[PDB]
C-alpha cells in the first residue's frame, strides 16, 4: 500500500501511532512524507532517525523548516528556542542525520500513479519538465560540499515571477520559494510571500496556487503539506492538502492512495 502523511514537525509519537493504525509494513508499503519533519514538536531527533532508517520505503520531499534546520546546523542561521531543535543539533549522530537530510529530494513523481509531491505544491507557472529541472538544480546545490553558501543564498522573497531567463541567485531563490514556501498567487501566477491565512481570509486578489489552472495539475494529482491554515480543506479534485496542523494541536493525516482512504491521529499537544 502507499501512504502519504503531512507535516510531522517533530511529532514522533503521533507519527508512529498513525503508522501503527494502518499497519505500515516496510517492504510491503511505501510512505510519502510532505516534509517539515522537524521543529516545534518535541521529537525532531527521533523523527529524523526513524525516517532515515526507512530507506527505499520512504519518499520524502524537503520543506522550509527542514532547510532552516540545515541552515542552523551549517552556522548560516540562528537557532530559535521555539523550534526545539537543540536535542537534534547536539546529538552524536547529527552529522550523519543532517548530511542524509540535505541529500533528499524537493520533488517526488510516480508516473504509474500519475502522482506528484512537493512540500508547498507546484506553482502554476511550471510545467513538469521545468519543475523537474528546478528540483534537480537545487538538489544539486544542497547535496554539494558547498551547501552552506546556497543555504545563505536561498533567503529572500524576490523574484516572485518565474521566467526561463532567470539566472543565478534570483533563480535559486524563486525555485526554493516555489517548492517550500508557496501558498497564494496573484492572478498571473506570481507568488505572494506574505499571506499565510486560509483562502477565505486572504486579501483580494490573492488565490491559492491550486486555484490557478496549471499544466502539471491538469495531468497529475498533486499532494503537498506546508499550508496548515488551509486545514486540509477546500481543494479541487486531484489536489491533496495533507498538512492538518499536528504540531499546532490539530491532527496528523495519512492518506492511502489505493482507495483514497484517510486515517487521522489526534495531536497529543
Ligand atoms: C501561525 O501560522 C504561521 C504559519 O504556520 P505554518 O505551519 O502554516 O507554516 P510556516 O511557519 O512554515 O510558514 C506561523 O507563524 C504560526 O505562528
Ligand atoms: Mn509545516
Ligand atoms: Mn512548511
From Swiss-Prot:
The keyword Cytoplasm does not apply. The keyword Hydrolase applies. It catalyses: P(1),P(4)-bis(5'-adenosyl) tetraphosphate + H2O = 2 ADP + 2 H(+). CDD domains: MPP_ApaH. It is an enzyme of class 3 (hydrolase). Coiled coil: none annotated. Keywords: Hydrolase. Hydrolyzes diadenosine 5',5'''-P1,P4-tetraphosphate to yield ADP. Monomer. Belongs to the Ap4A hydrolase family. This is Bis(5'-nucleosyl)-tetraphosphatase [symmetrical]. The lineage of its organism: Bacteria, Pseudomonadati, Pseudomonadota, Gammaproteobacteria, Enterobacterales.
Amino acid at each position: 500500500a502507499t501512504y502519504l502523511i503531512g507535516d510531522v514537525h517533530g511529532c514522533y509519537d503521533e507519527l508512529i501511532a498513525l503508522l501503527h493504525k494502518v499497519e505500515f509494513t516496510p517492504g510491503k508499503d511505501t510512505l510519502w512524507l510532505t516534509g517539515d519533519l522537524v521543529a516545534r514538536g518535541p521529537g525532531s531527533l527521533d523523527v529524523l532517525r526513524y525516517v532515515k532508517s526507512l530507506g527505499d520505503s520512504v519518499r520524502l520531499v524537503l520543506g522550509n523548516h527542514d532547510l532552516h534546520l540545515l541552515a542552523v546546523f551549517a552556522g548560516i542561521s540562528r537557532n530559535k528556542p521555539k523550534d526545539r531543535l537543540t536535542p537534534l543539533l547536539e546529538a552524536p549522530d547529527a552529522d550523519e542525520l543532517l548530511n542524509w537530510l540535505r541529500r533528499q529530494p524537493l520533488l517526488q513523481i510516480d508516473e504509474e500513479k500519475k502522482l506528484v509531491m512537493a512540500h508547498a505544491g507546484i506553482t502554476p507557472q511550471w510545467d513538469l519538465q521545468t519543475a523537474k529541472e528546478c528540483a534537480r538544480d537545487v538538489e544539486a546545490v544542497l547535496s554539494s560540499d558547498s551547501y552552506p553558501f546556497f543555504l545563505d543564498a536561498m533567503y529572500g522573497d524576490m523574484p516572485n515571477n518565474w521566467s526561463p531567463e532567470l539566472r543565478g541567485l534570483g533563480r535559486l531563490r524563486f525555485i526554493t520559494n516555489a517548492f517550500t514556501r508557496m501558498r497564494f498567487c496573484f492572478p498571473n501566477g506570481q507568488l505572494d510571500m506574505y499571506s499565510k491565512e486560509s483562502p477565505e481570509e486572504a486579501p483580494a486578489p490573492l488565490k491559492p496556487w491550486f486555484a490557478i489552472p496549471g499544466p502539471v495539475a491538469e495531468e497529475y494529482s498533486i499532494a503537498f503539506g506546508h499550508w496548515a491554515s488551509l486545514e486540509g480543506k477546500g481543494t479541487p479534485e486531484g489536489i491533496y492538502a495533507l498538512d492538518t496542523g499536528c504540531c499546532w494541536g490539530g491532527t496528523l493525516t495519512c492518506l492511502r492512495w489505493e482507495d483514497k482512504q484517510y486515517f487521522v491521529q489526534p495531536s497529543n499537544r
